[PDB]
UniProtKB/Swiss-Prot annotation:
The keyword Metal-binding applies. The chain holds residues 106 to 384 of 384 of the full protein. Residues 7-279 form the Peptidase S8 domain. GO terms for biological process: proteolysis. It comes from Parengyodontium album (Tritirachium album). Its cofactor is Ca(2+). GO terms for molecular function: metal ion binding; serine-type endopeptidase activity. Disulfide bonds join C34-C123, C178-C249. This is Proteinase K. It catalyses: Hydrolysis of keratin, and of other proteins with subtilisin-like specificity. Hydrolyzes peptide amides.
């Protein structure tokens, strides 16, 4: 299939060169997979989700996305126009308040919830979790993410927006999950993107159009925006049987676009998420 006039990030992850505008992808579109977006929530009513999004857990007085960040990230996973895997099921877990903030105790609680909750749900192609969040180094938080991965979930977490080594941030610094850095439409490493040896893959992250609260859209920037590209891609490939939850991050990095980003510091991988879809 092909989406003409797609957001540059969708076009990037189906192309061996930047500057293109059509998103080529296998029509399976992540059908039969599930992706937990662990964030400020998801505005499930958004027409862009086509009824494929629901909330399943909140840790605050409401489960509504009063910020937009979570709806923006979910839209990159599986919205019709802004999504990598357009037929995947989205599940919202609100560990972040409407200001974008979340306690670590709460985020750990959310990850443990996902590992268990996946057993209530019909996800015959497998389960992904997208964690566009993080903070300073915490070994409990890294531990929480490794548990979720070990439980059978493909975890992707943002590398961070500190323009620093991600070794000092969490869950970015957990070796067993997929840590996603951000690039721009010109294949530069994004100005804010963290880096370092913990990084596994890069995804589109600067000026990313996606869904927003109030039935709307907007472009924003962050490694929070690169993560759902990789999360959505993992669900896409799993639906296709190309890879499993435990091996998707390695699969994505072995088949990425290699050596094509600029301003990658020494000791950080130069790999850009890529679907290698050949019609």
């Amino acid at each position: 299939a092909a989406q003409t006039n797609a957001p540059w990030g969708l076009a990037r992850i189906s192309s061996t060169s930047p500057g293109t505008s059509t998103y080529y992808y296998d029509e399976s579109a992540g059908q039969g997979s599930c992706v937990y977006v662990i964030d400020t929530g998801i505005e499930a009513s958004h027409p862009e989700f086509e009824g494929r999004a629901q909330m399943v857990k909140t840790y605050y007085y409401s489960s509504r996305d009063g910020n937009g960040h979570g709806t923006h990230c979910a839209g990159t996973v599986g919205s019709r126009t802004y999504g990598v895997a357009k037929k995947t099921q989205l599940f919202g877990v609100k560990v972040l308040d409407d200001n974008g903030s979340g306690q670590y105790s709460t985020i750990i609680a959310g990850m443990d919830f996902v590992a268990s909750d996946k057993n209530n749900r019909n996800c015959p192609k497998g389960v992904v979790a997208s964690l566009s969040l993080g903070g300073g180094y915490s070994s409990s938080v890294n531990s929480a993410a490794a548990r979720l991965q070990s439980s059978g979930v493909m975890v992707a977490v943002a590398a961070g927006n500190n323009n620093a080594d991600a070794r000092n941030y969490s869950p970015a610094s957990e070796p067993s999950v997929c840590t996603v850095g951000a690039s721009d439409r010109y294949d530069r490493r994004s100005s804010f993107s963290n880096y370092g040896s913990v990084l596994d893959i890069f995804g589109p992250g600067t000026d990313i159009l996606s869904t927003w609260i109030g039935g709307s859209t907007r472009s924003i920037s962050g490694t929070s925006m690169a993560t759902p590209h990789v999360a959505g891609l993992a669900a896409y490939l799993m639906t296709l049987g190309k890879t499993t939850a435990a091996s998707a991050c390695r699969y994505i990095a072995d088949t990425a676009n290699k050596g094509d980003l600029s301003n990658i510091p020494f000791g950080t991988v130069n790999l850009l998420a890529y679907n290698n879809y050949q019609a």
